């Protein structure tokens, strides 16, 4: 039990780091899509998808 509990914490650390990286990537995607919609190249429907993913 001690060994398993010890390793679960490192698993959680790894998961947290990679989830933060994914969050950064998706935020940049949303920024790009919103800028593109403002400039007039995409429809409002594509903005909603980015917001949902974020």
């Amino acid at each position: 039990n001690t060994a398993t509990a010890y390793f679960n914490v490192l698993n959680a650390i790894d998961v947290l780091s990679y989830t933060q990286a994914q969050k950064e990537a998706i935020y940049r995607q949303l920024d790009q899509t919103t800028q593109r919609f403002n400039v007039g190249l995409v429809a409002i429907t594509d903005v909603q998808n980015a917001r949902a993913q974020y």
Binding site: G40, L41, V42, A43, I44, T45
Partner: protein, 49 residues
């Protein structure tokens, strides 16, 4: 394409391009009309003999 544009459910670039295509087609039709007129100016007599 026009009515969908009234609401924001279609890219503005696409509608702009549709308008431009209409204008270009009109211009090319004018070109053809002028060519036909140019040929007609030599045989406006309307009698072969």
């Amino acid at each position: 394409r026009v009515p969908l544009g009234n609401a924001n459910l279609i890219g503005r670039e696409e509608l702009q391009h549709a308008r431009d295509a209409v204008t270009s087609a009109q211009a090319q039709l004018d070109v053809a009309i002028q060519q036909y007129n140019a040929n007609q100016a030599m045989i406006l007599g309307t009698k072969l003999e």
